[PDB]
């Protein structure tokens, strides 16, 4: 409000006055709801449990459950599952993702040998912001599984692209590292009150050569007839 | 009953029983629509993607034989034999264990009943379900991971 | 490894240093943005009020023997932070074992009792708890709390 | 010092993390004997001249100033603290000039007064994570400025 | 209602159950996000960095054999077999001890059950879990630290 700047001035001088505010109520209700959901689903001891239709199932339930906990516990799924719930309540829709990860890393040990160590292999999960999902607009969001395509907007670190190329996951790499510099044009942004615009973006030089930064990318899954798309018969 | 004027105990329980109801209905929607999807997906991958060796390492002594882990791809595709469960209607393993203990008592008596069931296994199973998870170690002969793999290999 | 300061340029020391510095500088940008805000919370913790003009007079009266009103900032908010910090300390730190272990399979059960003992030696004999209380206050007070670990 | 290009929640995904620290001269010296530190002669020189703290706590908090950092030993020499930074980085060795590999690894460096590098080493812990742990009051999962109860 | 006064045996149990709920949700966030990280890290180092000799010294009679302490590096990297736990959902060792005691009584009856289990060990284990921790010292033969290492 216009009257506010004056009040702030008074406060600086030592006096006191009224500055305006928006009442809390609604926030409190969202927060109370989020709690109900976290307690009902996430804070439980097993989280994912299995029930069996026939006798054969009973034999397999105990083991399956164990393998599922390794994955929630050792794959750090829960931090991301809390957000999915907030999002739905806050924005109206919440989108999550799933993938399989085999992780390997290298470490130098002293003379001066190198080693490849094997880490977690299992499913991992992630959250897609509201502004990042790309859906099929011709089927309902509820009916997403029926439509032709779904995809997400993502940022990929150059170092990762390069490592992947060795394994065989990626290709056309030379052309890609070129875009590190101007790749990020951010169209949909957060509210002005929220900060983190960033600077000297993604461009840290390295001692001998190259630069280390990210490239904007999109991942899409499509249902297709191979003959038509040229990818097979 | 949200209005409060000196509520007694039944009254107190009553408005909260009722207020929760609209929130529980949301949960139920969430559970069927999206939690289920995630859960089913995780189950498919764990069954198909993990190799048998990895399955022993992640699951250990819980794998009492071939049946416990091995599965044909048909089952994975048709989703047969097991169903995902969630927070909204949880399963109580403790109750199940107590029934099993009663069954075992009956099998002990009535020697004819005893002839056609394997009592030791019922004891091991009940204990594991209750949560002990170490009964196997206590047994005179203990199976190591390498030993289990060999058994699975059949 | 040893990188030595020959002082000559085109040296491993010189080339590496430059790189590291760029990284430190990018990082420093974040702090700069959040600094003013973090400093305000401190005033709130300490319940400070910029003094009023009428106040100096009052202090003078008090010295002479009389009494008058000197202004203040109301407590409420402080009380709520303090009540919250307590909840957290009780839930996590004041417990008997603090770090406990649960096991997925039978093999784990064999190893749980020993591991736990080794973990207490470390919390108890390494004086971790005094530092864990602060991490919790910081988060509530400032919004973020960072902790570290070393052998 | 964080990486400003990934969210604070997602710190483990970014290239670097580090802290600003003060090291006592006596410690640097002891370490040099064990083999932990190097370039020591140059470092002791900065004892008298190394103090600038750009970001400081609010005046109300009561942080004070000794204003006289160093003390002289009987035989000559001064005991004091040299300001330093410790940073952990993920790097491709070939490029950084430290070896031949094309795969990213983690290393730690300590730089003193932004002029000399007093320590560097590979990191060899089975997990690949940087050694720091962070707690935040607010529940957004994407980049934001976190709030605290007082604010 | 949080602030109703002259409350019954039920309000005392209703606003407070409710009020704590928003605080518990904070705890849960803290637990998953950062406490977990610390805990997992401590666990890795203790397993990898300590030498076996040091492990006997820190852990003592709790090391009943090779299995108890020795571990391959694969496990340390893949985090298999044990999971960190915290204050928010604690484990009750006392209850576990009681179930084990019932198990022990059953082993004693039904001599066939007795044949395939080691009863002495169940007794030692239950006692240690409950917190005794001196049971071993009272046995006729006592193992010293040097003996354990061997």
Å between C73 CA and nearest CA of chain E: 25
In units of Å, what resolution does this entry have?
3.6
Are the CB atoms for D4 and C24 separated by under 8 Å? Answer: no
Q: Do residues D96 and A208 lie in contact, with contact meaning Cβ atoms separated by under 8 Å? A: yes
Q: Which residue has the tokens 């249902």?
A: A223
Q: What residues contact D16, with CB distance under 8 A and at least 6 apart? A: C23, C27, D1, D3, D87, D88, D89, D90
Chain C positions contacting chain E at CB under 8 Å are 84, 87-88, 91-93, 95, 98-105, 107-108, 110-115, 117-119, 121-122, 136, 139, 145, 147, 149, 151
Distance CA D150, CA C45 (A): 8
Reported in sequence order, the residue ranges of B44-143 that DSSP labels E, i.e. its strands, are 83-85
Closest residue to A208, CB basis, from D97, D128, D145: D97
Write out the two tokens for D121: 């080493």
| Residue in C26, C136, C143 closest to D146 by CB | C143
B10 at E interface, C-beta within 8 A: no
Contacts of E9 in chain B (CB under 8 A): 9
Whether residue B81 contacts residue A53, with contact meaning beta carbons closer than 8 Å, is answered with yes
Name the pairing type of β-strands D105-112 and D116-122: antiparallel
Element (H or E) spanning D133, and its range? strand D132-136
Name residues whose C-beta falls within 8 Å of residue A6's C-beta, 6 or more positions apart in sequence: A17
Distance between CA E25 and CA E15 in Å, rounded? Answer: 16
Contact A190, A131 (CB under 8 A): no
| Distance (Å) from the alpha carbon of B154 to chain C's nearest alpha carbon | 22
Provide the residue count of chain C. 151
Asked if residue D119 lies in contact with residue D110, where contact means CB atoms within 8 angstroms, the answer is yes
Residues ≥6 apart with Cβ < 8 Å to D122:
A107, A108, A109, A110, D105, D106, D107
Using CA atoms, how far apart are residues A213 and C133, in angstroms rounded to an integer? 37
Q: How many CA atoms lie within 13 A of E115 on its CB side?
A: 4
The residue with tokens 């791809």 is: B73
* Cα dihedral across residues A49, A55, A57, A60: positive or negative: positive
Q: Determine the Cα–Cα distance for residues E103 and E92; give it in Å rounded to an integer.
A: 17
Which of C89, C88, C149, C87 minimizes the C-alpha distance to C123?
A: C149
Radius of gyration of chain A (CA): 25
For residues E94 and E92, give the distance between their C-alpha atoms in angstroms, rounded to a whole number: 5
Breaks in chain B, after residue numbers (C to N greater than 2.5 Å): none
Task: Name the residue in chain C with its Cα closest to that of B136.
Answer: C106
Angle between helical axes of E15-30 and C76-88 (0-180°, round to 10): 70
Contacts of A109 (CB under 8 A, 6+ apart): A115, D122, D124
What is the C-alpha separation between B74 and B108, in angstroms, rounded? 39
Tokens standing for residue A220: 């899409």
Experimental method: cryo-EM
Q: Residues with Cβ < 8 Å from C147, sequence gap 6 or more?
A: C131, C132, C135, D132, D133, D134, E34, E38
- Transcribe A188-226 into DSSP letters: S---TTS----SSTT-EE-SSS-EE-EEEEEEEEE---H
Cα(first)–Cα(last) distance of chain B, in Å?
Answer: 65
Instruction: Name, in order, each residue with C-beta under 8 angstroms of C115's C-beta and a sequence gap of 6 or more.
Output: C101, E43, E46, E47, E82
Residue B99: CB partners within 8 Å, gap ≥ 6?
Answer: none
Q: Is D26 helix (H, G, I), strand (E, B) or coil?
A: helix
What would the 3-class secondary structure string for A22-79 be? CCCHHHHHHHHHHHHHHHHHHCCCCCCEEECCCHHHHHHHHHHHHHHHHHHHHCCCHH
Nearest to E77 among A69, A82, A119 (CB): A119
C16 contacts on A by Cβ (under 8 Å): 207
The CA distances from residue D24 to A130, D48, D71, D83, E68, in Å, are 50, 12, 12, 9, 41
Contact C103, C112 (CB under 8 A): yes
Inter-chain touch E41–D131, beta carbons under 8 Å: yes
Three-state DSSP class for residue A121: strand
Of C23, C50, C104, the CB nearest to A14: C50
> Strands, DSSP E only, in chain E?
83-85
Q: Residue E22 and residue A35: Cβ atoms within 8 Å? A: yes
Would you call C89 exposed, middle or buried from its count of C-beta atoms within 10 A (0-12, 13-18, 19+)?
Answer: middle
Full DSSP string of chain C: --------SSSHHHHHHHHHHHHHHHHHHHHHHHHHHHHHHHHHHHT--PPPTHHHHHHHHHHHT----------HHHHHHHHHHHHHIIIIITSSSSSEEE-SSHHHHHHHHHHHHHHHHHHHHTT-HHHHHHHHHHHHHHSEEEEE---
d(CA E64, CA E118): 15
In eight-state DSSP terms, residue D5 is: T
Write the CA distances from E121 to A212, B137, E62, integer angstroms.
Answer: 58, 10, 13
Dmax (CA) of chain A: 81
User: Breaks in chain A at C–N > 2.5 Å: after which residues?
Assistant: 110
Rounded Cα–Cα distance for residues D130 and D9 (Å): 13
């Amino acid at each position: 409000n216009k009257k506010d700047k004056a009040a702030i001035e008074k406060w600086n001088k030592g006096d006191t006055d009224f500055k305006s505010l928006v009442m809390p109520y609604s926030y409190a209700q969202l927060m109370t709801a989020h709690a109900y959901m976290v307690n009902v689903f996430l804070n439980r001891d097993p989280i994912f449990q299995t029930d069996s239709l026939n006798g054969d199932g009973t034999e397999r339930e105990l083991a399956l459950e164990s393998m599922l906990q390794y994955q929630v516990k050792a794959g750090e799924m829960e931090p991301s599952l809390l957000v999915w719930f907030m999002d739905a309540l806050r924005y109206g829709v919440g989108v999550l993702g799933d993938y399989w990860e085999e992780h390997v890393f290298h470490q130098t040990v002293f003379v001066k040998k190198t080693r490849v160590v094997k880490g977690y292999e299992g499913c991992k999960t992630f959250n897609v912001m509201v502004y990042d999902f790309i859906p099929d607009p011709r089927v309902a969001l509820c009916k997403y599984q029926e439509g032709e395509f779904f995809g997400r907007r993502l940022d990929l670190n150059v170092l990762d692209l390069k490592k992947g190329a060795k394994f065989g996951k990626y290709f056309n790499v030379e052309h890609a590292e070129a875009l590190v510099a101007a790749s990020k044009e951010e169209m949909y942004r957060r509210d002005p009150s929220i900060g983190q615009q960033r600077s000297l973006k993604d461009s840290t030089m390295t001692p001998k050569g190259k630069q280390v930064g990210d490239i904007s990318c999109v991942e899409i899954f499509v249902r297709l007839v191979p003959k038509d798309w040229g990818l097979g018969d | 009953s949200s209005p409060s004027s000196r509520r007694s105990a039944t009254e107190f329980r009553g408005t909260t029983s009722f207020a929760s109801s609209r929130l529980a209905n949301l949960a139920y929607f969430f559970s069927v629509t999206g939690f289920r999807s995630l859960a089913k997906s995780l189950i498919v991958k764990t069954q198909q993607l993990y190799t048998v060796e990895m399955k022993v390492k992640v699951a250990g002594d819980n794998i009492k034989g071939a049946q416990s882990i091995i599965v044909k791809p048909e089952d994975i595709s048709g989703q047969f034999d097991i169903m995902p469960v969630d927070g909204t209607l949880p399963v109580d393993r403790m109750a199940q264990a107590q029934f099993w203990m009663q069954i075992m008592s009956m099998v002990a008596g009535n020697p004819v009943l005893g002839a056609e069931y394997r009592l030791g296994d019922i004891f091991s199973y009940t204990a594991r379900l209750a949560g002990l998870k170490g009964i196997d170690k206590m047994k005179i002969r203990i199976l190591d991971d390498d030993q289990i793999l060999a058994l699975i290999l059949a | 490894m040893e990188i030595l300061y020959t002082g000559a340029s085109e040296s491993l020391h010189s080339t590496i240093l430059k790189a590291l510095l760029e990284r430190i500088d990018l990082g420093d940008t974040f702090i700069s943005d959040n600094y003013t805000r973090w400093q305000a919370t401190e005033r709130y913790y300490m319940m400070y009020k910029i003094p009023n003009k009428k106040d100096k007079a009052a202090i003078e009266k008090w010295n002479k023997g009389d009494t008058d009103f000197k202004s203040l900032v109301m407590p409420y908010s402080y009380a709520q932070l303090m009540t919250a910090h307590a909840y957290m300390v009780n839930v996590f730190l004041n417990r008997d074992p603090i770090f406990q272990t649960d096991s997925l399979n039978g093999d784990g059960t064999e190893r749980e009792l020993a591991l736990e003992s080794m973990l207490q030696y470390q919390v108890k004999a390494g004086e971790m708890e005094p530092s864990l209380l602060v991490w919790f206050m910081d988060a509530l007070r400032y919004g973020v709390g960072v902790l570290g670990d070393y052998w | 010092i964080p990486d400003p290009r990934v969210a604070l929640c997602k710190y483990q995904e970014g290239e670097f993390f580090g802290r600003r620290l003060d090291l006592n001269v006596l410690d640097l010296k002891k370490g040099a004997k064990f083999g932990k530190y190097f370039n020591v002669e140059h470092a002791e020189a900065l004892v008298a001249a190394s103090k600038e703290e750009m970001y400081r706590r609010d005046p109300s908090i009561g942080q004070q100033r000794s204003l006289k950092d160093s003390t002289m030993t009987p035989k000559g020499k001064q005991v004091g603290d040299i300001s330093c930074v410790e940073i952990f980085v993920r790097l491709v060795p070939k490029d950084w000039g430290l070896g031949d590999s094309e795969f990213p690894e983690m290393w730690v460096f300590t730089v003193a007064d932004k002029k000399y590098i007093v320590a560097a080493e590979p990191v060899n812990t089975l997990d690949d994570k940087f050694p720091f742990h962070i707690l935040e009051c607010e529940i957004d999962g994407y980049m934001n400025k976190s709030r605290g109860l007082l604010e």
